[PDB]
Enzyme design. Sequence first.
Site, short mmCIF file in Angstrom:
data_model
loop_
_atom_site.label_atom_id
_atom_site.label_comp_id
_atom_site.label_asym_id
_atom_site.label_seq_id
_atom_site.Cartn_x
_atom_site.Cartn_y
_atom_site.Cartn_z
N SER A 98 26.42 -9.95 -2.99
CA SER A 98 26.18 -8.57 -3.44
C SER A 98 26.78 -7.61 -2.47
O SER A 98 27.90 -7.80 -1.99
CB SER A 98 24.66 -8.52 -3.65
N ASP A 228 26.59 -9.92 -15.18
CA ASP A 228 26.17 -8.98 -14.08
C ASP A 228 26.21 -7.56 -14.55
O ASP A 228 27.31 -7.04 -14.94
CB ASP A 228 27.09 -9.29 -12.90
N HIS A 257 23.33 -10.40 -11.80
CA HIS A 257 23.65 -10.15 -10.37
C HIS A 257 22.80 -11.03 -9.48
O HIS A 257 23.33 -11.63 -8.52
CB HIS A 257 23.35 -8.65 -10.11
#
Lengths: 277, 277, 277
Positions: A98, A228, A257
């Site tokens: 991330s 995502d 995600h």
Amino acid sequence: PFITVGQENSTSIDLYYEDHGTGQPVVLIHGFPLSGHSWERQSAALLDAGYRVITYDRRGFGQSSQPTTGYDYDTFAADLNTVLETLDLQDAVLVGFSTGTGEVARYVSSYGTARIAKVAFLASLEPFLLKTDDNPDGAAPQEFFDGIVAAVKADRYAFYTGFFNDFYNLDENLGTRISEEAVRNSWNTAASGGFFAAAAAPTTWYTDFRADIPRIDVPALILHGTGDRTLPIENTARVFHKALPSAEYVEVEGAPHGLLWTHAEEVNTALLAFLAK
Amino acid sequence: PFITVGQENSTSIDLYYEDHGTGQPVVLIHGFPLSGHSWERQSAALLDAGYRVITYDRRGFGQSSQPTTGYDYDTFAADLNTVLETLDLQDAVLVGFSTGTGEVARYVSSYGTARIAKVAFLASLEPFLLKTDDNPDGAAPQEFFDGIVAAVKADRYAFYTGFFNDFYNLDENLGTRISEEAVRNSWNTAASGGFFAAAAAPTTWYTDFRADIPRIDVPALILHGTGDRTLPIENTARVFHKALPSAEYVEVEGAPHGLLWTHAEEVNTALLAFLAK
Amino acid sequence: PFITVGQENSTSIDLYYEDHGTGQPVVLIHGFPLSGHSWERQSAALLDAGYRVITYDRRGFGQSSQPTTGYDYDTFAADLNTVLETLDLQDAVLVGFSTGTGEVARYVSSYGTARIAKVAFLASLEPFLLKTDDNPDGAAPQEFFDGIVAAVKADRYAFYTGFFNDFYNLDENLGTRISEEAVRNSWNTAASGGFFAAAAAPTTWYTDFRADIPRIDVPALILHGTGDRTLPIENTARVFHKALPSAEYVEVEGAPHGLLWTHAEEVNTALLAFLAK
Ligand SMILES: [Cl-]
Ligand SMILES: [Cl-]
Ligand SMILES: [Cl-]
């Protein structure tokens, strides 16, 4: 345990970290707004496979200090350099997830790869999220990022509930790939992070990493979920794959995600294959 | 506050502890998956009665370090020996609860009782929980314990909700002897413990303490609830009472495993009577 | 970060604190049963306006140590004196909220104002909450305070839910001026405080500060919500305004005790006007 990375007024800036196992070092770098404990399903698989696993909480998150200074990727890369120099790691693997994938690229570009064997980018933000004239593949204009800052400043606690609905795709995954109790843990971890970092970190996500990517000169993995909603795959991993065609490239269809939890088996299989190569 | 009990890679293994009051020292040892703060209803009564109360968080739990090494009762007994030697306690009382009663027996057997006045076993696991041919009074076969490890590894956060329903007998006690908010506190404390200890600690619960029990040569108390669904009384305290007939023996009818909260008055009365004797 | 203020048995008594920004120092002192992080909406506005912001967790709360000694306003004022002497603050502003306004008055009276530029009292307890014959303006008799101690000792976790309903006036403000998630954060912070401080702090709230108030010889602000159900305005700020007529006096109509969150804009405007004067 803590590593000191700087000072703010009368206080030291200390990052919480853990160091487990025996083997080649694998350093796991989390993203917003979680902590190193969010890697628990990967840390258990890497420890059983024979690696030494180092996790730390980035400045402003988890159990680390909460300064009001230094929220930029050059400082986050300096904090990572201090962790690697203090532990004197060699042949290390850097794995970012991330928004923690920004300091993996900026560290390699600024400090080089003498200590580094391989790098991995999971659900990454590269190469440059801001949509501009010279970057038509960007995800969104500046106003989108300013909006996230204004929503965190309005009430960060309520912000995290809507954030985690899109981070995990809870309308699809609650009850099957993620429980209510694991979501509650993630909210508790976000609420323990610093208030100033929560509203400052969004202003770093539109950093341009296009000049950093051609400085990656070690083997790399790029992995991303095609569901995502936080960092859309068409603006991130599919553009990064063209910029760094040497990397191993793995798409996990339908994953969100927050795929380190929801799709831990597929992430672990791809990480263990890349680490053994 | 912290006492260092070991090292893991670049980090120290530190146990969080507290030291309150004035008087004879009483050391309170919690069980899975809580912390020393779970003794608050007993610590308040012991402080008002004139004792010094020491509580610590076992390795992997609460605010203590979270190593991936040393999950066995000999190491847990070594950690207790370091706490008693560092504080230089004399004439101390050791009170264990739940799975923390394993290191009370293993400490006495390995290190002896020179520092110890008395010992107490509340909701204990002795003498040997595993059902085998030579131990027909054991509670369950090996497969039961392997099952708890697989459920923690699958999702420890959701595991703790089902665990606490049977730890407190919530179908009987929610709303009367325990509130929703005290259960929420216990879940938050479990989720703060280390992921590796949560899945490793269940593999220690089938340790055989039958050879340790005849080495107890100080006054002892054995207390247990007859509604315990976590460590059933027929396989634990009623068999321990035959192995150690000198101990004071107290059954609390209908109480669950988590009786330090739900039946605090009955526990406190029995502890204060045993401490004054 | 921590400042040591004392010792209890084998342990030090350490207060967690943070030190941010550049400018004139403003020290923010919270009340029961929260922590220095409860000032986040004011700390962000003071940092943007150019002040240095120091917050600490009082003994027994937040991330500070949890001793079983020293719960009286003279000790809380000694802890504040240690913070100011250790940081060597000059021309500082002391801002107290809720029950933390007791040590602001007791510090000024005992230690004087050589280090102090100005003081502010938000939702304060002065001058003397106990209703007696010589103090007809007091809020309640002794039995009211003994009742709060007995409710905390019965189950502090469930006590905090009813406490926060009246602290924030949730029947009026839930969903509009405060979210469910910000209330959950406040409950988590209360549950992290020490069990002994939670039941001891209520016995300090009937301290008489009438002799301390005429020793305030620097500019002062008195601010209070007229919907406060925790410290009623008729027994606190309206009586304090007559005792200290030099102070700036601000009533926020309809605001509850927890007005740093619910009415942050009105509090911030009044604080910034008073700081610039
Ligand atoms: Cl970030
Ligand atoms: Cl255990
Ligand atoms: Cl208080």
